[PDB]
Amino acid sequence: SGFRKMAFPSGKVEGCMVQVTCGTTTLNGLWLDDVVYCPRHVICTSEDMLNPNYEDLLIRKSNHNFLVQAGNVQLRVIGHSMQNCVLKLKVDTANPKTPKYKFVRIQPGQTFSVLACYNGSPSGVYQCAMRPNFTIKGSFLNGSCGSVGFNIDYDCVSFCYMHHMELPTGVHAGTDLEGNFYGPFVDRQTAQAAGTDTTITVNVLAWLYAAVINGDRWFLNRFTTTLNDFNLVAMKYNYEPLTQDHVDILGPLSAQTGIAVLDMCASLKELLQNGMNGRTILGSALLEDEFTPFDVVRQCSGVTFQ
Amino acid sequence: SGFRKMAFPSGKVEGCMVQVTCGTTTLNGLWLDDVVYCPRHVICTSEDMLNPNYEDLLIRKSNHNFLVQAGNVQLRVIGHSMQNCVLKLKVDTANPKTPKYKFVRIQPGQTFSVLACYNGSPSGVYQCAMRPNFTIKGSFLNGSCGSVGFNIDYDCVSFCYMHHMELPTGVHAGTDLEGNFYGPFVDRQTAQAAGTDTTITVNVLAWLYAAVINGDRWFLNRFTTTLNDFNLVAMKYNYEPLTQDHVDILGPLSAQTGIAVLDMCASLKELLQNGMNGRTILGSALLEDEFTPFDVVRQCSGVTFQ
Numbered sequence: 014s015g016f017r018k019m020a021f022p023s024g025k026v027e028g029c030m031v032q033v034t035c036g037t038t039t040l041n042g043l044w045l046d047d048v049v050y051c052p053r054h055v056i057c058t059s060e061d062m063l064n065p066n067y068e069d070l071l072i073r074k075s076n077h078n079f080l081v082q083a084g085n086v087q088l089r090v091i092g093h094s095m096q097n098c099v100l101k102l103k104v105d106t107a108n109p110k111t112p113k114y115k116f117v118r119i120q121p122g123q124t125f126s127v128l129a130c131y132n133g134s135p136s137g138v139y140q141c142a143m144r145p146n147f148t149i150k151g152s153f154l155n156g157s158c159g160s161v162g163f164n165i166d167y168d169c170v171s172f173c174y175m176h177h178m179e180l181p182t183g184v185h186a187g188t189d190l191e192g193n194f195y196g197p198f199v200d201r202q203t204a205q206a207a208g209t210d211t212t213i214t215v216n217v218l219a220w221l222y223a224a225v226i227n228g229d230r231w232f233l234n235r236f237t238t239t240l241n242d243f244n245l246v247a248m249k250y251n252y253e254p255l256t257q258d259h260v261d262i263l264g265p266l267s268a269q270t271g272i273a274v275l276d277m278c279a280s281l282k283e284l285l286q287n288g289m290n291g292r293t294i295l296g297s298a299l300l301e302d303e304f305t306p307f308d309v310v311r312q313c314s315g316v317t318f319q
Numbered sequence: 320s321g322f323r324k325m326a327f328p329s330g331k332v333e334g335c336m337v338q339v340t341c342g343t344t345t346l347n348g349l350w351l352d353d354v355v356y357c358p359r360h361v362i363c364t365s366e367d368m369l370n371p372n373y374e375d376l377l378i379r380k381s382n383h384n385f386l387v388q389a390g391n392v393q394l395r396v397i398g399h400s401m402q403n404c405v406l407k408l409k410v411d412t413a414n415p416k417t418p419k420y421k422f423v424r425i426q427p428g429q430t431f432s433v434l435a436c437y438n439g440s441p442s443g444v445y446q447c448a449m450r451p452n453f454t455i456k457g458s459f460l461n462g463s464c465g466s467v468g469f470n471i472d473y474d475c476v477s478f479c480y481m482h483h484m485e486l487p488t489g490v491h492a493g494t495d496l497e498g499n500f501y502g503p504f505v506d507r508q509t510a511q512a513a514g515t516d517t518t519i520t521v522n523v524l525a526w527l528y529a530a531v532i533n534g535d536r537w538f539l540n541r542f543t544t545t546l547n548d549f550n551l552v553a554m555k556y557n558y559e560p561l562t563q564d565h566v567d568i569l570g571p572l573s574a575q576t577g578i579a580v581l582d583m584c585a586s587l588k589e590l591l592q593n594g595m596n597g598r599t600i601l602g603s604a605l606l607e608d609e610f611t612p613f614d615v616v617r618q619c620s621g622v623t624f625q
């Protein structure tokens with residue numbers, strides 16, 4: 014038993030990280046096959062950040078302006094293209110450590126593991142969730158951009174995020190592996206507001222099941238509710254509205270514990286209006302929303318990976 | 320910026336995990352060089368657990384009673400010895416992926432990363448601390464024993480824990496890599512109490528510095544205290560007493576922020592007696608004690624690994 018913020022093993026990703034340099038800027042790139050992907054602002058100088066014309070900037074850059082390294086090994090750039098906000102650097106040497114991967118774009122509420130790196134070298138791994146406002150609350154310092162977020166499906170690494178920037182509020186934003194930002198952000202140094210954030214209701218319910226699985230059942234009650242009646246209370250506390258789909262995804266956890274999802278919603282409803290009254294759930298004094306139903310099943314069922 | 324429960328990249332450890340079988344028992348082993356280390360209770364049957372005589376049990380076992388696998392690859396056991404509560408299986412094939420390692424025994428309050436595995440396959444990675452009562456609050460299921468805890472020092476993996484069992488309270492216990500349990504536990508199925516647990520004061524102070532580094536400074540005050548006066552309040556709230564050594568280890572964080580350790584103790588003192596009054600620090604409503612001063616520096620300074 015037990016329950017922790019568990020991340021995916023990062024072995025498969027560690028072997029794809031490289032160091033990319035252009036001018037005085039050094040950041041990380043993702044080396045898969047014979048391509049190195051990295052944030053396109055790597056070609057900008059501090060003066061260009063205000064209002065960059067990436068197309069024109071890229072046109073003035075030649076393959077030898079890009080120094081790419083993989084430890085000692087220096088890769089040779091054969092070509093450079095730009096896809097959305099991501100830069101693709103064709104290289105002479107293909108990556109032998111290229112795992113079986115794919116690029117996916119996650120949705121708000123879904124979670125993934127982040128391999129924070131600096132100078133192409135791994136620093137740590139942690140789990141986090143894509144917030145409803147499309148930002149993430151990560152832990153990144155200068156030099157971290159190019160670090161990626163990923164998930165694993167047995168033997169397939171799914172890359173879903175590349176780090177690009179930080180907001181004054183302390184949160185982070187980036188794109189998927191096709192270069193499209195998550196959220197309304199653009200890569201230029203201007204004030205850009207992230208929408209209001211909300212609590213990922215489905216995740217909170219999953220965590221509550223996890224607690225029950227782990228013997229913490231004090232918050233359980235005999236009352237019941239309807240999806241409509243629950244949502245009315247939820248929206249008042251800035252919680253995402255719960256949909257029938259959410260209910261279906263929580264089915265497995267409901268099956269395993271014998272507690273209907275609406276019965277669980279009824280307990281959550283009470284907790285929102287009455288608070289936790291000095292008690293904790295799974296060691297926390299706040300309702301945790303960064304565990305998906307799948308994360309709970311995986312951790313409580315012991316799903317492993319090739 | 321940002322602050323998360325960060326674990327070490329597990330690449331180097333993933334390649335040392337193997338599956339060990341003996342009779343109807345299958346668990347994980349650690350394959351380094353030509354030795355596979357695993358919990359010695361792998362030779363026991365359910366009936367032997369009550370009061371096992373490991374020496375006699377081991378004597379009745381022959382090298383071919385141990386099936387060891389590394390994916391498809393089947394290793395061949397050439398010999399079997401027992402060191403304390405750990406079993407050493409000499410093998411015909413040495414591990415090519417054997418990293419530059421060493422075995423260390425940590426102290427209460429120190430943290431490490433755990434690579435949870437099942438059937439020799441990795442499941443996830445998470446950070447945790449050795450509690451003052453020598454247990455750990457991990458996340459492990461049946462089949463998890465042999466999973467290890469480790470740290471990394473540039474290019475050297477330091478193994479400091481091997482999982483053996485779980486207490487009814489839900490916490491976990493195991494040994495170091497030389498087979499000595501952490502705590503007063505013995506590997507037999509009998510009631511065995513873990514001592515009273517306490518809060519790792521030095522860690523809490525480190526986390527407070529982390530918060531300051533991250534802009535959360537509301538709890539700061541102009542008062543000051545003495546180590547003796549602080550400790551008197553601390554012991555009342557079941558906090559470990561703070562020693563001059565602790566103070567010295569917190570020096571780097573004090574240097575970086577310009578806040579004396581005793582000034583920080585004075586803020587913590589107030590928080591203990593007055594509470595957080597509906598506020599949070601680094602997103603938490605409780606004082607976190609599973610981050611060492613080093614963990615804070617590493618995460619706030621961006622230390623990486625070969």
Ligand SMILES: *[C@](O)(C(=O)NC1CC1)[C@H](CCC)NC(=O)[C@@H]1[C@H]2CCC[C@H]2CN1C(=O)[C@@H](NC(=O)[C@@H](NC(=O)c1cnccn1)C1CCCCC1)C(C)(C)C
Pocket residue numbers: 038039040052054062154155156157158177178179180181198199200201202203204205
């Ligand atoms: C990343 O490229 C990296 O690791 N580089 C290595 C060190 C050399 C780097 C990581 C910084 C911690 N990211 C950036 O430099 C991005 C790039 C890409 C988009 C613009 C520039 C600036 N930048 C930032 O992360 C900055 N943040 C901002 O510029 C935000 N600005 C404001 O909040 C703002 C702007 N004008 C007026 C008032 N406020 C913007 C906000 C909108 C979304 C994009 C980021 C810093 C300050 C470096 C964190």
Ligand SMILES: *[C@](O)(C(=O)NC1CC1)[C@H](CCC)NC(=O)[C@@H]1[C@H]2CCC[C@H]2CN1C(=O)[C@@H](NC(=O)[C@@H](NC(=O)c1cnccn1)C1CCCCC1)C(C)(C)C
Pocket residue numbers: 344345346358360368460461462463464483484485486487504505506507508509510511
């Ligand atoms: C591990 O070997 C594994 O992953 N095996 C794979 C599935 C085949 C396994 C993991 C279990 C979740 N560990 C154990 O089986 C250990 C071994 C080693 C020491 C004794 C046996 C039993 N065991 C346990 O983890 C059990 N826990 C206990 O036996 C605890 N007992 C009590 O609390 C107790 C005992 N008698 C009366 C009342 N209470 C003892 C407590 C003292 C310290 C050692 C553990 C289970 C119940 C399987 C978790």
